[PDB]
């Protein structure tokens, strides 16, 4: 036996190469480690979280340091709309002179990458101006990462290891994370915006050397304590304000103008300052809801176990049995992880959907490639987070759920009508797929036969009505905010719609992405998105709810979350575990996010080209997507290098192929299965044993990858190829035609 | 009211498409019908809106016709399957269609909505939950 892995004697005694592979695959599955107790589990998780925070801080510090060292931040400040931000320098000693010339650009005298993460715009908005400030921020983040690493080490020492009760105390953690982690952090960010960001945007330098004696507002803090809060909203930035200058600049620190700054085409800094102030107040209030040490406050266990509604006998909240759930969540780390992953996925989706339509950073809405990259990035991350939420829901079902302590509650009811849930999800998926695909191919056939007028073109009237209700007067509707006489627009009792003028100006501006005009193609692609969402949810939910067992495998819970199969008996049981359901659902998540990002990218490409009619007329049939989106926009990408030379897109050209390679490799791991490779490996073992001069000999017997390992490796190759190919295409097709 | 859709007979793009269309069976009368009855977008192609109280029959007739036909097929199949349950060899009745039974099922399913309502009211439409095979939880 080997020392490695330290956490599993079963793997340590494995005499094959599998021992290594599984050692990497189960290293962070702490609950299955040998002799693991709950307290040790929680303490190790605490230290690991400290390490992950340190890693995040080091990553941010590295981004800042490389921008300050090899970027062009100060040059980009003077002309954000025409200067390409620089990510970092290129040192690839096997470049040729054509590649060196092609990658020497953006005002640099050496090969550089063009930043597409938007960090230049973000740092510009928050008031950073010089490379020295970025360097100081990088040093500070290095020190912060060091502090968190030391904290992780310290909270593993015998005196500082928290007890299990400390980890299980939910109410104080909620109070501190609502009032302090969310509220106080938001208040401090609003303070940074008011004291630093806004003065810097008004041409006034505020730093550590002078922020103590430079008040952010002429009225001072006296106006706050005397109740004269309106003084903070007086004299806002004029519509002729020039960013990073005092020309047309007001003195207000907390306005509620709404809409966009006319020049930067982004949200007002004072608007975001007031936003974070209000958010901080709300979260600090929310952080006092639960009882910790002073009697006052709700008890979550009492709320979940309550059975009386002001005297009347109810079975629970909304007359639904919620009893016993407090112990279910409080004892299941996977349940909490499922909620956390689902919340983070929804938050990432909202981030993507709200930053492109309401850009928060100066001029970032005019950096088309950056916009596309950020949207695609956060949408794909959201999809992965949703997949993880449901995977850990299934893990909870198998490992942490017991029917006895959840007898008769709402979770048990869901487990009892899982069949109806899954069948109705399947019906929704079938209806959406059948009708969406049928209408798409009907339009395909009609357009192919020279009968484009015979297409079924269903108008998205409900979403158009919502847009009109939000103030979009293009459609001719006269409802709510698009009707100036409506009670919604006037707000008759109080007329406090100080947001409405700017909001309407932003909505009806034709040069932004705020409520883009939508037609039949948008209708069809949203229904395709709904189909993808419902099928991915069906796969994940069917896996989670059947994780404990089914008719084919009644005793699945006794086999764990991830096992290959139950053999060829009973008809065959390939891909029967809930892990296999998550594996299958990753494919559908990738497909759905591909549809979503294809739609976003093609619509915005049509808008940026000035050829919105192309999308409007071609998105209603799938040949339009295949020809006018993929084939039409692949030309510059695939001409990054050719027999006539190379340009700056060459890297993307290579990566575009690289992804297609990785994707292809995935098929090998996904189509061919283990026994073939095991027999081939046996033949190779014979060959090696019978060949002279080959003094090497395996210390771990070479074996084919396991079934589950093969599925995981194939999925990893598939996803990596997917991401690399689409990212290369996105960057090349947007940057190759624009800045 | 909706202003981004106009009648196809008043859309210059639709008129251009109509004029440039080939003169065959597939275009003349269909284009006249679209001009008289359809609403067109700025692209000149007919669009189907669901924001009009008027022409509500244009929405209800196709939906109702399809729902009737689909319910007819479903009720025929369901009644045939229920009639074959009492047989000795229902699987053979499923790979070998019983013509008298299928004809009777189709004739009854001609009036499928009333039969479905009667079955739902009498509790005969659905089987009890405890009498359906299920998997362990």
């Amino acid at each position: 036996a080997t020392k490695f892995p330290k956490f599993s004697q079963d793997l340590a005694q494995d005499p094959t190469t599998r021992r290594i592979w599984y050692a990497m695959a189960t290293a962070h599955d702490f609950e299955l480690h040998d002799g693991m107790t709950e307290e040790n589990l929680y303490q190790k998780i605490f230290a690991s979280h400290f390490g992950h925070l340190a890693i995040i801080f080091l990553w941010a510090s590295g981004v800042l340091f490389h921008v300050a060292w090899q970027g062009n931040f100060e040059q980009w400040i003077k002309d954000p709309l025409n200067v390409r931000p620089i990510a970092h320098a290129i040192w690839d000693a096997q470049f040729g002179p054509p590649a060196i010339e092609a990658f020497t650009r953006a005002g640099a005298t050496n090969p550089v990458d063009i930043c597409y993460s938007g960090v230049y715009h973000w740092w510009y908005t928050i008031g950073m101006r010089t490379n020295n400030e970025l360097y100081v921020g990088a040093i500070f983040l290095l020190l912060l990462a060091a502090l968190f690493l030391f904290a992780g080490w310290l909270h593993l020492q015998p005196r500082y290891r928290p007890t299990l009760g400390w980890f299980k105390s939910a109410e104080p953690r909620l109070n501190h994370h609502l009032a302090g982690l969310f509220g106080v952090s938001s208040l401090a960010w609003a303070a940074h915006l008011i004291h630093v960001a806004i003065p810097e945007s008004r041409g006034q330098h505020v730093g550590w050397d002078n922020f103590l004696f430079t008040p952010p507002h002429p009225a001072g803090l006296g106006a706050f304590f005397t109740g004269n809060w309106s003084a903070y909203a007086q004299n806002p930035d004029t519509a002729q304000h020039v960013f990073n200058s005092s020309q047309g600049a007001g003195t207000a620190i907390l306005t509620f103008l709404g809409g966009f700054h006319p020049q930067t085409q982004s949200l007002w800094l004072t608007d975001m300052a007031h936003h974070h102030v209000a958010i901080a107040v709300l979260f600090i209030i929310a952080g006092h809801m639960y009882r910790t040490n002073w009697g006052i406050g709700h008890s979550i266990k009492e709320m979940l176990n309550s059975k009386s509604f002001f005297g009347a006998k109810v079975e629970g909240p909304f007359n639904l049995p919620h009893q016993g759930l407090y112990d279910t969540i409080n004892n299941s780390l996977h349940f909490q992880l499922s909620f956390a992953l689902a919340a983070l996925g929804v938050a990432s989706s909202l981030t993507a959907q709200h930053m492109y339509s309401m850009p928060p950073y100066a001029f970032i809405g005019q950096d088309f490639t950056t916009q596309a990259a950020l949207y695609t990035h956060h949408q794909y991350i959201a999809g992965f987070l949703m997949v993880g939420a449901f995977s850990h829901a299934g893990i909870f079902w198998i490992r942490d759920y017991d029917p006895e302590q959840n007898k008769g509650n709402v979770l048990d009811r869901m487990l009892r009508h899982k069949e109806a849930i899954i069948s109705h999800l399947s019906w929704v998926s079938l209806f959406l797929g059948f009708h969406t695909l049928g209408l798409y191919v009907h339009n395909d056939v009609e357009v192919a036969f020279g009968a484009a007028e015979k297409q079924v073109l269903i108008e998205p009237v409900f979403a158009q009505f919502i847009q009109a209700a939000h103030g979009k007067a293009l459609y001719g509707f006269n409802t709510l905010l698009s009707n100036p006489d409506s009670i919604a627009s006037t707000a008759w009792p109080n007329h406090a719609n100080v947001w409405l003028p700017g909001w309407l100006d932003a909505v009806n501006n034709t040069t932004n992405s705020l409520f883009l005009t939508i037609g039949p193609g948008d209708f069809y692609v949203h229904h395709a998105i709904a189909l993808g969402l419902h099928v991915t949810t069906l796969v994940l939910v069917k896996g989670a709810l059947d994780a404990r067992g089914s008719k084919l495998m009644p005793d699945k819970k006794d086999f764990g979350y991830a096992f290959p199969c139950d053999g060829p008996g009973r008809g065959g049981t390939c891909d029967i575990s809930a892990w296999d359901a998550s594996y299958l659902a990753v494919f559908w998540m990738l497909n759905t996010l591909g549809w979503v990002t294809f739609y976003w990218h093609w619509k915005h490409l049509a808008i940026w080209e000035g050829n919105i009619a192309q999308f409007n007329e071609s998105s209603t049939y799938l040949m339009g997507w295949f020809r006018d989106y993929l084939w039409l926009h692949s030309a510059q990408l695939i001409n990054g290098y050719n027999p006539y030379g190379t340009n700056s897109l060459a890297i993307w050209s290579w990566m575009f192929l690289w992804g297609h390679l990785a994707w292809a490799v995935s098929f090998m791991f996904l189509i061919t299965w283990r026994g073939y490779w095991q027999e081939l490996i046996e033949t190779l073992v014979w060959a090696h044993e019978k060949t002279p001069l080959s003094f090497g000999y395996w210390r771990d017997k070479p074996v084919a990858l396991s079934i589950v390992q093969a599925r995981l490796v194939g999925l990893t190759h598939f996803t990596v190829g997917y991401i690399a190919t689409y990212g290369a295409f996105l960057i090349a097709s947007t940057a190759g035609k624009f800045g | 009211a909706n202003s981004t859709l106009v009648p196809c007979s008043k859309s210059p793009a639709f008129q251009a498409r109509m004029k440039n269309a080939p003169d065959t069976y597939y275009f003349n009368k269909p284009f006249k019908a679209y001009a008289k009855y359809e609403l067109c977008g700025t692209d000149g192609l007919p669009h189907l809106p669901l924001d009009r109280l008027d022409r509500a029959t244009d929405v209800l007739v196709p939906i109702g016709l399809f729902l009737y036909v689909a319910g007819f097929i479903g009720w025929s199949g369901r009644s045939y399957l229920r009639a074959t349950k009492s047989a000795s060899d229902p699987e053979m009745k499923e790979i070998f269609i019983d013509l008298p039974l299928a004809l009777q099922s189709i004739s009854k399913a001609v009036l499928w909505p009333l039969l479905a309502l009667q079955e739902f009211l009498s509790g005969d439409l659905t089987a009890r939950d405890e009498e359906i095979p299920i998997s362990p939880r």
């Binding site: 209700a469 006269n478 409802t479 | 109280l53």
Partner: peptide, 29 residues
């Protein structure tokens, strides 16, 4: 069973949907 609570919640949600549709259909403003 008439399902009192279920049908009351369902009717409230349906009334909300019908009100939104009436606004959407220009029946009320």
């Amino acid at each position: 069973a008439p399902f009192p609570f279920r049908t009351i919640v369902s009717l409230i949600l349906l009334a909300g949907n019908i009100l939104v549709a009436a606004i959407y259909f220009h029946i009320i403003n």
